[PDB]
Design a protein around this motif. Structure first.
Motif, short mmCIF file in Angstrom:
data_model
loop_
_atom_site.label_atom_id
_atom_site.label_comp_id
_atom_site.label_asym_id
_atom_site.label_seq_id
_atom_site.Cartn_x
_atom_site.Cartn_y
_atom_site.Cartn_z
N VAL A 62 6.45 2.93 5.74
CA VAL A 62 5.35 3.11 4.86
C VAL A 62 5.51 4.50 4.20
CG1 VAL A 62 2.84 3.48 4.84
CG2 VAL A 62 3.80 2.04 6.58
N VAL A 63 6.29 4.24 2.94
CA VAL A 63 6.94 5.42 2.38
C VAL A 63 5.97 6.21 1.38
CG1 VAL A 63 9.04 4.51 2.66
CG2 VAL A 63 8.04 3.84 0.48
N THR A 70 -0.62 -1.55 -0.48
CA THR A 70 -0.10 -3.05 -0.41
C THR A 70 -0.06 -3.59 0.84
OG1 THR A 70 1.16 -2.25 -2.41
CG2 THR A 70 1.88 -4.33 -1.11
N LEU A 71 0.55 -2.81 1.90
CA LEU A 71 0.57 -3.44 3.39
C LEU A 71 -0.70 -3.66 3.67
CD1 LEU A 71 2.22 -4.52 6.03
CD2 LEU A 71 2.24 -1.85 6.43
N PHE A 72 -1.73 -2.81 3.66
CA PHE A 72 -3.14 -2.93 4.04
C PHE A 72 -3.71 -4.37 3.45
CE2 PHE A 72 -7.55 -2.16 3.71
CZ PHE A 72 -7.95 -2.04 5.03
N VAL A 75 -2.11 -7.39 4.91
CA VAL A 75 -2.43 -7.59 6.24
C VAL A 75 -4.04 -8.18 6.32
CG1 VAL A 75 -2.88 -6.66 8.44
CG2 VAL A 75 -0.73 -6.20 7.04
N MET A 76 -4.88 -7.37 5.47
CA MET A 76 -6.30 -7.71 5.63
C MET A 76 -6.50 -9.06 5.11
SD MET A 76 -8.10 -5.28 7.00
CE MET A 76 -6.63 -5.07 8.16
N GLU A 77 -5.97 -9.30 4.04
CA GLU A 77 -6.11 -10.66 3.30
C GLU A 77 -5.83 -11.92 4.37
OE1 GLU A 77 -4.22 -11.39 -0.27
OE2 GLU A 77 -4.65 -13.51 -0.42
#
Lengths: 152, 22
Positions: A62-63, A70-72, A75-77
């Motif tokens: 997570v840079v 984007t990752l959140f 993952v939530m989707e």
């Protein structure tokens, strides 16, 4: 009350939780009763997830705020794809932002002391837009969540 | 591939929470 499903209230909960994880809570009265109840349950979940998913969480780097968002969102989707909402799933949203802030504290290329305010912002956006109607219909934070999760 | 793995893990952790308070 009924208005606790609007953005400001949710954003404060999301920010409070990250300040708890980072050990920098607000001064004075500090967190509300809702936040106090939420932080205990969300942290318990967070620790379990960090342990049970250790291997696949090692894959994520997570840079930046943008990659955290984007990752959140990805993952939530996937977590919520089936359309089901309930308090346990809502708690995992907070647990997951706690994981993200910890990864950023170590991995963010351009660290900024305001970062937790940006992370909690996009967390609040998701909660409000994707779970806010269910939250309201189930009593909100005061008459729904706290009533069910406060101590016996 | 780990995006889906994380999401599956969160769904499972959520179910554990629901089983406790419900």
């Amino acid at each position: 009350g009924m208005t606790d499903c609007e953005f400001g209230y949710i954003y404060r909960l999301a920010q409070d939780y990250l300040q708890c994880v980072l050990q920098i809570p607000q001064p004075g009265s500090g967190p509300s009763k809702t936040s106090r109840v939420l932080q205990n349950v969300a942290f318990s979940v967070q620790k379990e997830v960090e342990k049970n998913l250790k291997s696949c969480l090692d894959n994520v780097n997570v840079v930046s705020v943008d990659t955290a968002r984007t990752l959140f969102n990805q993952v939530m989707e996937k977590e919520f794809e089936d359309g089901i909402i309930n308090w346990g799933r809502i708690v995992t949203i907070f647990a997951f932002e706690g994981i993200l802030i910890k990864k950023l504290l170590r991995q963010q290329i351009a660290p900024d002391v305001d970062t937790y305010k940006e992370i909690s912002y996009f967390v609040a956006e998701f909660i409000m837009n994707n779970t806010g109607e269910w939250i309201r219909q189930n009593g909100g934070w005061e008459n729904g969540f706290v009533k069910k999760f406060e101590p016996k | 591939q780990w995006v889906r793995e994380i999401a599956a893990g969160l769904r499972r952790a959520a179910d554990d929470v629901n089983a406790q308070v419900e």
